[PDB]
Amino acid sequence: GVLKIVKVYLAVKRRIQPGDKMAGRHGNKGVISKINPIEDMPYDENGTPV
Amino acid sequence: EFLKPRLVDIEQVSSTHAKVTLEPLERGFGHTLGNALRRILLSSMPGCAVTEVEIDGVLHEYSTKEGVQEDILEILLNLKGLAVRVQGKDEVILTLNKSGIGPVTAADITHDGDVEIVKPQHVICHLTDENASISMRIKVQRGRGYVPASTRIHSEEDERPIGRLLVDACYSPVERIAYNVEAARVEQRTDLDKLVIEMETNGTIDPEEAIRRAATILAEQLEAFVDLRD
């Protein structure tokens, strides 16, 4: 019944955003709640932010 | 009864790393200025970054060139890091054309007057074939902050050319900023402090100009803020 077929592959680049699920190797899990600017994040004495 | 901070010695340990000190700080404003400056520096420093790339034989980020080893996507990722200083104009189109076996670094880009390539050693690609030749045009814009590929579509303006390869724009030269307030004991005075701002950047903005521009922006916002028209 099918005359012809056309398949099309889309490549979508999905960026991390709020609501994705992240986990560790030890069973710790969580939802990404908010993405803060680099400034707001705590920073070490040396100045490297977490 | 107050004092004022004057820009005193501004040492540069490396091309990227700079220490800027402010000696005559009254008690209590060490931390206030440290923090305000840190915030503005990290958020608002205007810088240049690669916005788009056109390579001839490549329709989309996923295909591959003959005779090269990095994928097109990885070449884009490498171009994202290219630190370039444009003086007068806002949008420059650099052209990289190299052939033969060898690692094509950023230095091989055709050097235009107004453009300065801060780190010529930055690697771009590795050729693997005597006749393999790559030509491309990298379009670099001026901008502040962070604009992704997906947002820039709003200003599409007839993006019809499928050859155009969008890169996320990290429009920010300041990598790291820390401040240390230490008592600056001057032989005739009781309680004065020095701010030592240690700043690491990709080698585009000079420290003095960064600090000045930050103070400018803060001053403008405080101007607007002080007056209150009910």
Scan for tokens 């701002």, then name that residue: B197
Q: Position of tokens 């010529």?
A: B120
Report angle CA B117, B206, B12 to the nearest 5 degrees. 105
Q: Tell me the two tokens of residue B226.
A: 């002080």
Contact B43 A37 (CB under 8 A): yes
Beta carbons of B195 and B21 less than 8 angstroms apart? yes
Locate the chain B residue with the closest alpha carbon to A46.
B178
Nearest chain B alpha carbon to A39: B39
The partner residue sitting opposite A47, judged by closest CB among B39, B61, B176, is B176
DSSP conformation class of B87: -
Query: In terms of C-beta distances under 8 Å and separation of at least 24 residues, what long-range contacts does B151-154 make, across chains too?
Result: B152/B51
Sign of CA dihedral B66, B67, B69, B70: negative
Q: How far is B63 from chain A (nearest CA, A)?
A: 12
Handedness of CA B44, A43, B208, B105 (dihedral sign): negative
**Closest in B39, B60, B148 to A39, CB measured:** B39
With tokens 């055709």, the residue in question is B110
* CATH number for position B140: 2.170.120.12
The phi and psi torsions of A23 (rounded to 5 degrees) equal -150, 165
Distances (CA, A) of A3 to A6, A7, A8, A9: 11, 14, 17, 21
What's the alpha-carbon Rg for chain A, to the nearest Å? Answer: 21
The whole-angstrom separation of Cα B41 and Cα B109 is 30
Neighbours of B6 (CB within 10 A): 8
Q: Which of residues 23-42 of B touch A (CB under 8 A)?
A: 38-39, 42
Approach to solving: cryo-EM
3-state helix, strand, coil in chain B (%, to 5): 25, 40, 40
What is the rounded CA–CA span in Å between residue B198 and residue B179?
6
> How close, in Å, is residue B178 to chain A by CA atoms?
5
Confirm or reject contact between A28 and chain B (CB < 8 A).
Answer: no
Distance from CA of B168 to the nearest CA of A (A): 12
Which residues span the domain enclosing B163?
46-171
Looking up tokens 């503005």, which residue turns up?
Answer: B40
What residues of chain A lie within 8 A of the CB of B178, using their CB?
43, 45-47
Tokens of B75: 């070449």
What residues have CB less than 8 Å from B134, skipping those under 6 apart? B55, B65, B68, B96, B97, B98, B99, B104, B125, B127
Angle, to 10 degrees, between the axis of helix B29-44 and the axis of helix B207-226?
110
Q: In degrees rounded to 5, what are phi and psi of residue B223?
A: -55, -55
The pair of three-digit structure tokens given for residue A28, joined into one six-digit string: 């710790």
CA–CA dist B63, B230 (Å, integer): 60
- Kindly identify which residue of chain A lies nearest to residue B44, measuring between CA atoms: A39
B42 min Cα distance to partner chain A (Å): 7
B61 contact residues in A (CB cutoff 8 A): 11
**Amino acid found at B156:** E
Do the chains contact at A39 and B43, CB–CB below 8 Å? yes
